[PDB]
């Protein structure tokens, strides 16, 4: 969170597994595997996305014809903010502790 020292806010991030529509309100997304944090002295929050799947490995290439995206959604909301208008939340992504890839191909760099 990159806001000033007087702007305070709290957020949540939830993981909606596939099977129905992803949630559009933080009330509806309270029933996911979620997590909340508020902006204070330590200004960084790291949330590890769980790997839930039927099969043991999931495809890193989303299917060309199949347009439902049946691996999952991840939603992040704001719940409230105090005088945090126009202020930012820069996000990042990293590999997890137990993240491992498999079966290299060469599918031409898009």
């Amino acid at each position: 969170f990159t806001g000033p020292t007087d702007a305070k806010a709290r957020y949540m991030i939830a993981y909606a597994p596939p099977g129905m529509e992803p949630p559009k309100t933080p009330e509806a997304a309270a029933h996911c595997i979620h997590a909340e944090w508020d902006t204070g002295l330590n200004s960084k929050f790291t949330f590890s996305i769980p790997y839930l799947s039927a099969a043991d490995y999931t495809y890193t290439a989303s299917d060309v014809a199949e347009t439902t995206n049946v691996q999952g959604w991840v939603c992040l909301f704001q719940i409230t903010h105090g005088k945090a208008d126009g202020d930012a939340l820069v996000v990042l992504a990293s590999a997890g502790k137990d993240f491992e890839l498999r079966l290299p191909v060469d599918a031409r760099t898009q």
Partner: protein, 207 residues
């Protein structure tokens, strides 16, 4: 010398004409703690009870091979079917129990079978339904058949909205032969129950 009264959870099922329970394909469950779920599974002990359903009416005009195929899980309007609309990935076994109550003066028999992934069958294929977990019912000997199977499947947890692994199949091997002293029409019921369900992954609420 006989213990012939089963129960799952807080529901019991006493039969006095049980020829025996047939454990199909395994006597014990698989490792439920998979690596495709990151340890976020949990057992729901409140899904383990029976639920009754109707199958068909075995009458005297039914020839060989009047089969009935209901896909498990079917519409459970209780605790178990709440988990289908509230959790994405789940696995379970089954312990089915069909009843065909006539009397000991009817004849004929109907085979009962739990068969995985069953679709597009032939009537010429019905001669080898014995390979699956099966148990015969004839009114001269018994009234029930009690089959128990574990979770089979392509992968450890399943999405039951897009997939139905098991299929309870009852077909009639010999036709129902009523007599002067038998029962005219018998009705086939069944009470099915899950065993040790394990859900993983909470859906968002529909609101």
């Amino acid at each position: 010398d006989r213990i012939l009264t089963t129960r799952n959870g807080h529901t019991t099922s006493t039969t006095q004409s049980s020829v025996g329970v047939t454990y199909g394909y395994a006597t014990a469950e698989d490792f439920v703690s998979g690596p495709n779920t990151s340890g976020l599974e949990t057992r729901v002990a409140q899904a383990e009870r029976f639920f009754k359903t109707h199958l068909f009416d075995w009458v005297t005009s039914d020839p060989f091979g009047r089969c009935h195929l209901l896909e498990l899980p079917t519409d459970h309007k209780g605790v178990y079917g709440y988990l289908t609309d509230s959790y994405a990935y789940m696995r379970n076994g089954w312990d089915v129990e069909v009843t065909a109550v006539g009397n000991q003066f009817n004849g004929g028999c109907l085979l009962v079978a739990m068969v995985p992934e069953l679709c597009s069958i032939q009537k010429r294929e019905l001669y080898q339904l014995t390979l699956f977990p099966h148990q015969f019912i004839n009114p001269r000997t018994n009234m029930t058949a009690h089959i128990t199977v574990p979770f089979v499947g392509v992968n450890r947890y399943d999405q039951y909205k897009v997939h139905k692994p098991w299929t309870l199949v009852v077909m009639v091997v010999a036709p129902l032969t009523v007599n002067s002293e038998g029962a005219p029409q018998i009705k086939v019921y069944a009470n099915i129950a899950p065993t040790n369900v394990h859900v993983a992954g909470e859906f968002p609420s529909k609101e």
